[PDB]
Design an enzyme around this catalytic site. Structure first.
Site, PDB file in Angstrom:
ATOM      1  N   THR A 297      77.947  -6.786  44.778  1.00 20.89           N
ATOM      2  CA  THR A 297      77.878  -7.743  43.651  1.00 20.89           C
ATOM      3  C   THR A 297      76.527  -8.424  43.584  1.00 20.89           C
ATOM      4  O   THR A 297      75.952  -8.826  44.619  1.00 20.89           O
ATOM      5  CB  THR A 297      78.963  -8.842  43.744  1.00 20.89           C
ATOM      6  OG1 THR A 297      80.242  -8.264  43.514  1.00 20.89           O
ATOM      7  CG2 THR A 297      78.757  -9.891  42.690  1.00 20.89           C
TER       8      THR A 297
ATOM      9  N   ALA B 140      87.522  -9.698  45.278  1.00 20.15           N
ATOM     10  CA  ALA B 140      87.923  -9.568  43.888  1.00 20.15           C
ATOM     11  C   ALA B 140      89.148 -10.453  43.598  1.00 20.15           C
ATOM     12  O   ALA B 140      89.067 -11.381  42.796  1.00 20.15           O
ATOM     13  CB  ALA B 140      88.196  -8.110  43.548  1.00 20.15           C
TER      14      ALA B 140
HETATM   15  C1  LIG Z   1      96.094  -5.457  53.214  1.00 12.14           C
HETATM   16  O1  LIG Z   1      95.040  -4.889  52.487  1.00 12.14           O
HETATM   17  C2  LIG Z   1      94.165  -5.888  52.192  1.00 12.14           C
HETATM   18  C3  LIG Z   1      94.259  -7.177  52.740  1.00 12.14           C
HETATM   19  C4  LIG Z   1      93.338  -8.179  52.402  1.00 12.14           C
HETATM   20  C5  LIG Z   1      92.317  -7.872  51.502  1.00 12.14           C
HETATM   21  C6  LIG Z   1      92.235  -6.573  50.984  1.00 12.14           C
HETATM   22  C7  LIG Z   1      93.157  -5.583  51.299  1.00 12.14           C
HETATM   23  C8  LIG Z   1      91.085  -6.594  49.990  1.00 12.14           C
HETATM   24  C9  LIG Z   1      90.690  -5.154  49.593  1.00 12.14           C
HETATM   25  C10 LIG Z   1      89.417  -5.068  48.812  1.00 12.14           C
HETATM   26  O2  LIG Z   1      88.357  -5.099  49.425  1.00 12.14           O
HETATM   27  N1  LIG Z   1      89.536  -4.957  47.500  1.00 12.14           N
HETATM   28  C11 LIG Z   1      88.344  -4.791  46.645  1.00 12.14           C
HETATM   29  C12 LIG Z   1      87.357  -5.937  46.708  1.00 12.14           C
HETATM   30  O3  LIG Z   1      87.734  -7.097  46.795  1.00 12.14           O
HETATM   31  N2  LIG Z   1      86.090  -5.533  46.667  1.00 12.14           N
HETATM   32  C13 LIG Z   1      84.933  -6.442  46.689  1.00 12.14           C
HETATM   33  C14 LIG Z   1      83.981  -6.032  47.804  1.00 12.14           C
HETATM   34  C15 LIG Z   1      84.737  -5.969  49.135  1.00 12.14           C
HETATM   35  C16 LIG Z   1      84.941  -7.376  49.689  1.00 12.14           C
HETATM   36  C17 LIG Z   1      83.841  -8.224  49.867  1.00 12.14           C
HETATM   37  C18 LIG Z   1      84.006  -9.513  50.382  1.00 12.14           C
HETATM   38  C19 LIG Z   1      85.288  -9.949  50.705  1.00 12.14           C
HETATM   39  C20 LIG Z   1      86.384  -9.105  50.516  1.00 12.14           C
HETATM   40  C21 LIG Z   1      86.222  -7.814  50.004  1.00 12.14           C
HETATM   41  C22 LIG Z   1      84.212  -6.410  45.311  1.00 12.14           C
HETATM   42  O4  LIG Z   1      84.048  -5.373  44.659  1.00 12.14           O
HETATM   43  N3  LIG Z   1      83.795  -7.589  44.881  1.00 12.14           N
HETATM   44  C23 LIG Z   1      83.105  -7.698  43.605  1.00 12.14           C
HETATM   45  C24 LIG Z   1      84.117  -8.108  42.538  1.00 12.14           C
HETATM   46  C25 LIG Z   1      84.114  -9.430  42.122  1.00 12.14           C
HETATM   47  C26 LIG Z   1      85.020  -9.837  41.161  1.00 12.14           C
HETATM   48  C27 LIG Z   1      85.918  -8.928  40.616  1.00 12.14           C
HETATM   49  C28 LIG Z   1      86.895  -9.425  39.540  1.00 12.14           C
HETATM   50  C29 LIG Z   1      85.916  -7.597  41.026  1.00 12.14           C
HETATM   51  C30 LIG Z   1      85.010  -7.177  41.994  1.00 12.14           C
HETATM   52  C31 LIG Z   1      88.759  -4.473  45.209  1.00 12.14           C
HETATM   53  C32 LIG Z   1      87.560  -4.321  44.291  1.00 12.14           C
HETATM   54  O5  LIG Z   1      89.435  -3.234  45.249  1.00 12.14           O
HETATM   55  C33 LIG Z   1      90.109  -7.578  50.614  1.00 12.14           C
HETATM   56  C34 LIG Z   1      91.236  -8.581  50.958  1.00 12.14           C
HETATM   57  O6  LIG Z   1      91.184  -9.799  50.792  1.00 12.14           O
END
Ligand SMILES: COc1ccc2c(c1)[C@H](CC(=O)N[C@H](C(=O)N[C@@H](CCc1ccccc1)C(=O)NCc1ccc(C)cc1)[C@@H](C)O)CC2=O
Ligand SMILES: [Mg+2]
Ligand SMILES: [Mg+2]
Ligand SMILES: [Mg+2]
Ligand SMILES: [Mg+2]
Lengths: 212, 235, 233, 242, 222, 237, 241, 233
Positions: free
Chosen positions: A1, A49
């Site tokens: 991001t 996200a």
């Molecule tokens: C049990 O499985 C679990 C448990 C806990 C958690 C996850 C999975 C999650 C899986 C998960 O990662 N899910 C993904 C996610 O949160 N990705 C982040 C980067 C990774 C990240 C970075 C910092 C903190 C957490 C995650 C991302 O793309 N951020 C930019 C972004 C910003 C805003 C928006 C609207 C969309 C995207 C989604 C996009 O599928 C992480 C989490 O809290």
């Protein structure tokens, strides 16, 4: 991001990428990282996200409630402090968010607050947030003047997200652009990096580390 | 707790009614000290004077109360006031300002007036204190939880009678020794007994500590009351 | 935080044309000690349902009490308890699956794998599995533990898909069950020669066979095996 | 005196009946539901000429698509409004849509039920019924424009038109004659202003009476004083010429 | 130690047409290297013309689907039989998922239906309730195999107009239900070839302005 | 409730008894290896579905209860009895002994006569079954009072029912088979219906017998019911 | 605890306990407020039953809620202290969360809500208090005055009065307060406030107290000598005809 | 005698009566009439809705509880909302936990027990609503009548509310005919619409007056109002 917001002569530029990742997987290229809280208030999202989407939507609800209660729009200061105080209640539970609250009110003028899940809340003129922040900062800081035209300021914001989309593996997709005025946000479009890169290269004569 | 059609509180009214039967307590504030004097309620030869305190109580080193009403209710309150003073000392490393302690105590009384369907405390207090904001101070509180400040005041029986007498002889420029006299004279005039003898009195002063720069609470032993009843000429 | 102590190995099962068959051996193990030998792990509920249980035996005994209580309770103020409002295999199942999933969600599981077998009131075969995680699935054949790795492949040669089930007779199905039990006795170090078997049939009802034994074992070929490579005598 | 939820021998709840009596002593509030909107008007009724009348809030916004008017012990109405707003915002949080007007009313009525202790079957955090009634007006896509009357008995009714408060017996009969399905918003505005004028104890002007409405296109609006004044020119001339 | 989570395999895919949507999933349920069932459906008709799958840990998937079906029931009770629109379903599911933020459901979930204008719609969630509307999405075990195919064959990405020297892109058209089912079947035969957890059967749920229709195809059983 | 009268009585409980006397008549009869329960159900209107407003209740598997007075108060008492029998089985493994169960109901009914904020129960309950050491029949009054009985009746037909019950004790001192007690129960219920004849009635019988039901509580239905109805019809005429 | 209902409805529709609460306010000392063009003045009467008081330490009737808002009351004195404390707490809490001092309307709504709450909760009696809340919103010169009462009803007033004989002084203020022409200054606003009290007090010695609130957190009490000069000038000037 | 004895539900009268409960029963007699009846294959509710004015809506008397169950009300309407909500919850619980449709009979027992606690707890009133419950379950069509005393009875037909005594007498008379009305939804409704007529001193029942509900063999529980009832007037 990568997300940024800066104040200048003619208000506020808000610019964000649209890439979502899990590990090295690219989850989406078309994600919405700006939340239009009300016509004078924007929120940007970096980190988790879900955490971001959920708590900024919720912040929208709390902001609307203030309007009904006080027959007046919430100050940028107070909207940011709601989110700040919520997040602080959760400290140490693993919430992960870096956030900008951007808006205009008569009493405050144009205002940016940065808010993160460690509980930090700062007021300032320039913020870049996310894994791509340093890249955005490099372009933004070296071409930033207070008196930039609206047109240029829009371009610089656009150009700073592109910088970061190119260098940072975890940024990319498209730029979403916003201008915040007295009147007060205006959407200046979605710009796919796919096309924008080549176009900027051509017209600007930059990106010389790139074959093609 | 309920209101009467007149907008009065029955139980509170009746508690004040109870207090008007209790031994009179008088407080007079002078410029260099404070006097607290109280009359013990119709006693007996066999009552231990030397180890008795029913009307005068130490709250900390700088504050005392004279009690009119149910002793047992007063001890409940006195004890919480003592705790409250120590919490303050612990929190700020300063002795509690007199008003603050009086206000807290009054608020506990007000509470019983407004919720919980318990009876109010049948107690009225005269507080005698010193602090470095207002110097010597005198305050009163009754079962309603109301409180007020005074140069001279009485509670319990004959307050109306005792108040008029104090009004008459009280003068701002008084020394504590003149206040001592005034208080004993006023109790003497208002007793429902032959004479006001030592064995029917409790007496205390808050002076500027003989010669120091410091504040001292003197709770008179029976012997001292007999001697001070000599000077003022009531044998 | 918990760990199974006294356990009992596979439960294996299949549907045939008219009903279901389920079997389980009579052992309760204590790690590698073959500790107790009269352990019944087939639990009849009403006469249209058998619950087969593997895993921790203390938890098994708890689930027995729960099922007995369930029969008592369904009888209460229920004049049709032995007809139209009799407990169905699907009710017993759903109940257990709920308990199983709630217990894992509290981080305090019932340390079992469970197969519910029976015939519904409309004649339909019922065969479903739930385990300590609340995972559930259904199949023409089902087995827990080693049975999953060794009985299923054998049972699936008989009933390989839905369309195989009108084609399978009681006799064929019971033969396949009995044979799979023998294979498990050959290869599972936590198994026992003694087992129980139950048939629940849309016509016959409930046949509960006790004190069955693995028969017709092959061991003769063992006399020819000398050494571990080169040794001749 | 024995209980707060005792039945009378007729089979009614004492306290509920009496709260209904507190409403009859309230100011007048009138609502009319057209097909071009729903108008809500109230009698301000200042208790002195030194009271600043625009500080009299008897018409409140609940959401953009829902307004309400109160009559009775109007202080009781704060927590009902707070609850109504929370329910509508919350619904929008959970569901990314507007709460139906009927659903919002039902929620306010559920709140109103909560007098007692926890009446042995659950929990009641309130000692008496509310002494205030509400007219709840709004638009939604299923049922269009709607007017509800919410009572401290926790019952509610839909109404083509409705009056509550001191002048309500008289105002209702009036509404029984004037209301037809065809009224424009302007026709309905005038009717509210007319019927308030009839039942008020002052001469109705733009200070002792207040108008509002809700339309699908513009949401819920409280008309400012200049606008109502110009509707009061308009009513005066319409009637003086008939 | 007790581990509250497992992995049931399993792959699901959503595509939105112009006036239809599909949700497909394989019918195979696995644990480690064993097969639990060759036919255990994981795409569900939830009423109100909404279909749903929650893929990953099957016990969490089941729990969520149950919980959401129940949301739909209580929505009718409390809102006078109002149809729960797809966008509203989506928002709801986000709260279900995010409610367990600190003990999550190990599912990736996809729902499919029609929007307010009768356009095909597809929404997809991460395990903790982040969500988006998309033209198409693959989720689960073979998702990393199937998604890029979809990016290429549904959204025509990286395809340019022949001869334009890469400026005019293949213009983004809509696909028929026939063309969509073709891509679905191919996506799954591909995934079955290259992923060990994918196979046995394919169940497709099709949603139109006349309800929900089911289609089934054998997949390789190895 | 918590209130003693100047002579040591409790008027509220005495009034609770009036609710019971007002009730339908119900009985229980102890036989040589079991217990039989019967109750009069007033057919208010022809619209009542026959056989379908069951009054007799089972507790665990081995205990029947019947009651007269306020029916909701009886159901409340049985819910509590079921909980109390479950708790016993959970801890001691064995199904609850009838005397044990009696006291559980006893202590609960008695509790509702200690506190001003509660009313006594408005039922008398007749209950029993077979345990490890034989058959038992009990009757429980609104005060919490209970004793063991050879036969018991309560409700409006109580007086004649007791008179009939008393005869049987005299003619059959050598114990009454379970099948006999069923017949006699049908008879007795008929002979207390006399009083409430204005409206029609329907008969319900249940039994718990070591040799006839294996010590489980069962409802008398079908041919056995019809035969007991016939006995009573022929013995009333 | 004890939550038995004490405040309930009468056959004719009143809540008796709230009505009797208003009676307690009626017999409380009188209090008045009027707003100038660029100020607000608060006046209170002190009783004459006891006159050997110490004015240094006796709680006066006007209270600062914040640096820009004031509160006076009529009714049970002990009852008022519970309201003043909560209002002070709320005011700091609002600076903490919204980063801005409260508006006078906000603070009033808040006190009123507390009063209302105590009319519908089991085991508590209503507040025997009515209040006057006065001051200026942050960064605003337009003066504010509000009244609350035991019911929880609240409203703004150009001028208002509460307590015993408030009826007389209200009547006085209706004749004397002109809306088009508010008292143009502090001095002439204080006078009108003293005049209204003189109607009820009958000597304005140490029994009339005045507090003046100007914009931007400027709040000063008045001494004996400053009040005395008003009384002197009022009775002399207004005697001839 | 009625003197000091009707203060609360926690006091017996010297006759052994509970006046608070009898008073609650009196609010039912005030409520607008409603009729329930059934055959072997369907059950029907018919209610006369009551307006508060000619400018108002006629307030609803029928509430859906599950796909196979619902009820009509007579008395305090908010009391009906409490009980139908509880019943909706009980129905739901039974589906989720046991995958079982709740027996209409068990729904009776549950409502009864709930009403009961309110006839015995200090500081709470009894419920002041009567209910007619219809459903189709595993033993067919059912109709129940619920009184706030907690008495629930299973009936072929009945009526509650003001003037309901007419309808009841009619149903008592019609019995042997409507009981056999099978596989004909519309004839059974007609018999219910006619039965409710015997209870009108009012008016000629209009397209708003009328509320009809049905449930049975192949029909989910469904509510008819407005235009959809005209064909029965
Ligand atoms: C049990 O499985 C679990 C448990 C806990 C958690 C996850 C999975 C999650 C899986 C998960 O990662 N899910 C993904 C996610 O949160 N990705 C982040 C980067 C990774 C990240 C970075 C910092 C903190 C957490 C995650 C991302 O793309 N951020 C930019 C972004 C910003 C805003 C928006 C609207 C969309 C995207 C989604 C996009 O599928 C992480 C989490 O809290
Ligand atoms: Mg929607
Ligand atoms: Mg494969
Ligand atoms: Mg008692
Ligand atoms: Mg008896």
């Amino acid at each position: 991001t990568t997300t940024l917001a800066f104040r200048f002569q003619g208000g506020i530029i808000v610019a964000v990428d649209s890439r979502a990742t899990a590990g090295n997987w690219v989850a989406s290229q078309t994600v919405k990282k700006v939340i239009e809280i009300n016509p004078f208030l924007l929120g940007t999202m970096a980190g988790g996200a879900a955490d971001c989407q959920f708590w900024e939507t919720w912040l929208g609800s709390q902001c609307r409630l203030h309007e009904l209660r006080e027959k007046e729009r919430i100050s940028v200061a107070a909207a940011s402090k709601i989110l700040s105080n919520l997040v602080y209640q959760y400290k140490g539970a693993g919430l992960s968010m870096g956030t900008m609250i951007c808006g205009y009110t008569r009493k405050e003028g144009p205002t940016i607050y940065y808010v993160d899940s460690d509980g930090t809340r700062l007021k300032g003129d320039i913020f870049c947030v996310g894994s791509g922040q340093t890249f955005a900062y490099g372009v933004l800081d070296s071409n930033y003047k207070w008196d930039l035209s609206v047109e240029d300021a829009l371009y610089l914001g656009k150009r700073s997200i592109l910088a970061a989309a190119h260098r940072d593996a975890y940024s990319g997709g498209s730029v979403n652009l916003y201008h915040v005025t007295e009147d007060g946000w205006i959407y200046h479009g979605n710009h796919d990096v796919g096309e924008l890169f080549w176009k900027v290269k051509e017209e600007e004569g930059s990106f010389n580390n790139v074959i093609g | 707790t309920i209101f009467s059609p007149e907008g009065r509180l029955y139980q509170v009214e009746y508690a004040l009614e109870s207090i008007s039967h209790a031994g009179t307590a008088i407080g007079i504030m002078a410029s260099d000290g404070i006097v607290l004097a109280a009359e013990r309620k119709v006693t007996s030869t066999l009552l231990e004077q030397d180890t008795s305190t029913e009307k005068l109580y130490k709250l900390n080193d700088k504050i005392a109360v004279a009690v009119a009403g149910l002793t047992a209710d007063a001890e409940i309150l006195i004890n919480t006031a003592r705790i409250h003073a120590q919490n303050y000392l612990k929190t700020y490393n300063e002795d509690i300002p007199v008003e603050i302690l009086v206000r807290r105590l009054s608020d506990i009384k007000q509470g019983y007036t407004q919720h919980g369907g318990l009876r109010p405390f049948g107690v009225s207090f005269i507080y005698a204190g010193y602090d470095d904001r207002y110097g010597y101070q005198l305050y009163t509180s009754n079962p309603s939880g109301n409180y007020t400040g005074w140069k001279a005041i009485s509670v319990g029986a004959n307050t109306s009678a005792a108040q008029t007498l104090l009004q008459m002889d009280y003068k701002d420029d008084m020394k504590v020794d003149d206040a001592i006299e005034l208080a004993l004279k006023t109790l003497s005039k208002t007793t429902d007994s032959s004479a006001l003898t030592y064995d029917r009195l409790e007496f205390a002063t808050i002076r500027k500590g003989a010669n120091d720069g410091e504040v001292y609470q003197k709770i008179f032993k029976p012997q001292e009351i007999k001697d001070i009843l000599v000077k003022t000429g009531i044998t | 935080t918990q760990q199974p102590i006294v356990t009992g190995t596979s439960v294996i099962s299949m549907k045939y044309d008219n009903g279901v068959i389920i079997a389980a051996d009579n052992l309760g193990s204590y790690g590698s000690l073959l500790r107790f030998n009269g352990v019944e792990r087939l639990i009849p509920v009403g006469d249209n349902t058998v619950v087969g249980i593997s895993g921790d035996i203390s938890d098994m005994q708890h689930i027995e009490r729960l099922l007995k209580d369930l029969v008592t309770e369904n009888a209460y103020d229920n004049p049709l308890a032995d007809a139209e409002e009799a407990l169905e295999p699907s009710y017993i199942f759903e109940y257990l699956a709920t308990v199983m999933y709630q217990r894992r969600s509290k981080m305090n599981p019932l340390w079992n794998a469970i197969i519910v077998a029976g015939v519904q009131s409309n004649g339909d075969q019922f065969l479903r599995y739930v385990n300590l995680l609340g995972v559930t699935y259904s199949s023409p054949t089902l087995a827990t533990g080693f049975g999953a790795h060794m009985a299923n492949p054998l049972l699936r040669k008989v009933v390989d898909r839905e369309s195989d089930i009108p084609k399978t007779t009681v006799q064929v199905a019971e033969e396949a069950i009995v044979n799979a039990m023998r294979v498990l006795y050959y290869r599972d170090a936590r198994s026992s020669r003694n087992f129980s078997l139950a048939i629940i049939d849309k016509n016959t009802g409930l046949t509960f066979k006790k004190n069955l034994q693995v028969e017709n074992m092959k061991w003769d070929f063992a006399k020819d095996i000398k050494g571990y490579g080169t040794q001749k005598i | 005196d024995r209980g707060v939820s005792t039945f009378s021998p007729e089979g009614r709840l004492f306290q509920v009946e009496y709260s209904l009596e507190a409403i009859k002593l309230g100011s007048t509030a009138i609502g009319i539901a057209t097909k071009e909107g729903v108008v809500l008007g109230v009698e301000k009724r200042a208790t002195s000429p030194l009271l600043e009348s625009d500080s009299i809030e008897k018409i409140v916004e609940i959401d953009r698509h829902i307004g309400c008017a109160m009559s009775g012990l109007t202080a009781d109405a704060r927590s009902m409004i707070e609850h109504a707003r929370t329910a509508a915002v919350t619904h929008n949080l959970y569901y990314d849509e507007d709460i139906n007007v009927e659903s919002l009313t039902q929620s306010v009525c559920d709140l109103a039920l909560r007098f007692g202790e926890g009446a042995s079957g659950e929990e009641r955090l309130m000692s008496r019924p509310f002494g205030v009634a509400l007219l709840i007006a709004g638009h939604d896509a299923d049922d269009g424009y709607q007017l509800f009357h919410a009572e401290p008995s926790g019952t509610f009714y839909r109404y083509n038109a409705k009056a509550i408060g001191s002048g309500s017996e008289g105002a209702q009969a009036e509404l029984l004659n004037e209301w037809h399905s065809s009224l424009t918003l302007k026709e309905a505005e005038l009717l509210v202003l007319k019927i308030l004028k009839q039942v008020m104890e002052e001469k109705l002007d733009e200070n002792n009476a207040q108008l509002s409405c809700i339309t699908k296109q513009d949401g819920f609006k409280i008309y400012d004083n200049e606008k109502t004044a110009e509707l009061i020119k308009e009513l005066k001339e319409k009637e003086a010429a008939e | 130690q007790f581990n509250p989570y497992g992995d049931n395999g399993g792959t699901i895919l959503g595509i939105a047409g112009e006036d239809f949507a599909v949700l497909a999933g394989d019918t195979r349920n696995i644990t480690d290297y064993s097969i639990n069932s060759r036919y255990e459906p994981k795409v569900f008709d939830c009423g109100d013309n909404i279909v749903m799958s929650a893929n990953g840990f099957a016990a969490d998937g089941d729990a969520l689907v149950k919980r959401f079906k129940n949301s739909v029931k209580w929505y009718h009770f409390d809102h006078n039989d109002k149809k729960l629109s797809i966008n509203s379903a989506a928002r709801n599911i986000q709260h279900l998922l995010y409610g367990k933020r600190f003990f999550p459901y190990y599912v990736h979930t996809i729902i499919a239906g029609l929007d307010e204008d009768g356009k095909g719609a597809v929404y997809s969630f991460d395990p903790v309730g982040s969500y988006e509307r998309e033209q198409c999405r693959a989720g689960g075990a073979a998702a990393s195999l199937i998604m890029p195919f979809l990016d290429n064959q549904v959204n025509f990405k990286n395809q340019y107009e022949p001869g334009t020297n890469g400026k005019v892109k293949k213009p983004l058209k809509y696909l028929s239900v026939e063309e969509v089912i073709k891509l679905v079947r191919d996506s799954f035969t591909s995934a079955t070839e290259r992923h060990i957890q994918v196979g046995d059967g394919l169940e497709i749920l099709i949603v139109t302005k006349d309800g929900v229709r089911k289609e089934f195809y054998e997949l390789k059983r190895d | 409730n918590s209130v003693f009268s100047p002579d040591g009585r409790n008027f509220q409980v005495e009034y609770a008894v009036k609710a019971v006397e007002n009730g339908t008549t119900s009985i229980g009869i102890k036989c040589n290896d079991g217990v039989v329960f019967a109750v009069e159900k007033l057919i208010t209107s022809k619209l009542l579905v026959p056989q379908k407003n069951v009054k007799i209740q089972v507790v665990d598997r081995h205990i029947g209860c019947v009651y007269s007075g306020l029916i909701p108060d009886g159901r409340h008492l049985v819910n509590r009895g079921r909980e109390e029998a479950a708790s016993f089985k959970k801890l001691y493994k064995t199904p609850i002994p009838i005397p044990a169960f009696a006291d559980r109901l006893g202590q609960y009914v008695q509790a509702h006569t200690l506190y001003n904020s509660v009313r006594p129960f408005g039922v008398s309950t007749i209950f029993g079954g077979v345990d490890k050491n034989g058959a038992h029949l009990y009757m429980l009054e609104p005060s919490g009072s209970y004793w063991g009985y050879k036969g018991a009746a309560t409700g409006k037909g109580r007086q004649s029912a007791k008179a009939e019950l008393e005869k049987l004790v005299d003619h059959h001192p050598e114990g009454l088979s379970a099948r006999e007690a069923v017949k006699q129960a049908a008879k007795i219920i008929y002979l207390a219906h006399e009083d409430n004849k204005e409206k029609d009635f329907e008969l319900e019988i249940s039994w718990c017998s070591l040799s006839e039901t294996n010590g489980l509580h069962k409802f008398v239905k079908g041919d056995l019911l019809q035969e007991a109805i016939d006995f009573a019809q022929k013995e009333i005429n | 605890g004890y939550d038995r209902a004490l405040s309930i409805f009468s056959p004719d529709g009143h809540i008796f306990q709230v009505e009797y609460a208003l009676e307690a306010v009626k017999r409380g000392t009188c209090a008045v407020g009027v707003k100038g063009k660029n100020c607000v003045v608060l006046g209170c009467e002190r009783r004459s039953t006891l006159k050997l008081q110490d004015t240094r330490i006796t709680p006066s009737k006007v209270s600062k809620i914040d640096s820009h808002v004031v509160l006076s009351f009529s009714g049970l004195n002990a009852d008022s202290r519970i309201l003043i404390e909560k209002a002070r707490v709320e005011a700091q809490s609002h600076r903490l969360t919204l980063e801005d001092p409260v508006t006078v309307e906000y603070l009033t709504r808040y006190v009123a809500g507390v009063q209302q709450r105590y009319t519908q909760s089991g085991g508590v009696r209503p507040f025997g208090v009515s209040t006057l809340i006065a001051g200026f919103d942050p960064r605003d010169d337009e003066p504010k005055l509000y009244q609350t009462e035991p019911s929880g009803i609240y409203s703004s007033w150009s001028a208002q009065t509460i307590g015993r004989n408030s009826k007389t002084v209200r009547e006085f203020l209706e004749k004397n307060y002109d809306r088009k022409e508010p008292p143009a200054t502090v001095e002439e606003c204080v006078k009108l406030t003293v005049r209204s009290l003189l109607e009820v007090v009958q000597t304005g010695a140490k029994n009339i107290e005045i507090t003046v609130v100007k914009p931007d957190s400027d709040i000063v009490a008045l001494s004996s000598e400053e009040i005395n000069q008003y009384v002197t000038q009022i009775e002399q000037e207004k005697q001839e005809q | 005698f009625r003197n000091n004895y009707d203060g609360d539900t926690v006091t017996f009268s010297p006759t052994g009566r509970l006046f608070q409960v009898e008073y609650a029963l009196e609010a039912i007699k005030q409520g607008s009439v409603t009729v329930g009846l059934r055959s072997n294959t369907h059950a029907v509710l018919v209610a006369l809705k009551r307006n508060a004015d000619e400018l108002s809506s006629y307030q609803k008397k029928i509430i859906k509880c599950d796909e196979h169950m619902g009820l009509s009300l007579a008395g305090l309407a908010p009391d009906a909302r409490v009980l139908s909500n509880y019943l909706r919850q009980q129905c739901n619980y039974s589906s989720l936990v046991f995958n079982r449709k709740l027996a209409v009979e068990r729904a009776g027992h549950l409502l009864c027990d709930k009403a009961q606690k309110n006839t015995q707890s200090y500081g709470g009133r009894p419920y002041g609503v009567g209910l007619l419950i219809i459903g189709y379950d595993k033993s067919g069509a059912h109709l129940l009548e619920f009184q706030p005393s907690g008495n629930v009875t299973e009936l072929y037909g009945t009526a509650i509310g003001a003037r309901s005594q007419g309808a009841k007498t009619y149903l008592e008379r019609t019995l042997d005919t409507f009981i056999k009305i099978d596989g004909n939804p519309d004839e059974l409704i007609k018999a219910g619409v006619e039965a409710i007529s015997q209870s009108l001193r009012d008016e000629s029942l209009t397209v708003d007056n009328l509320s009809i509900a049905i449930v049975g063999k192949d029909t989910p529980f469904t509510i008819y109002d407005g235009e959809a009832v005209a064909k029965y007037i």
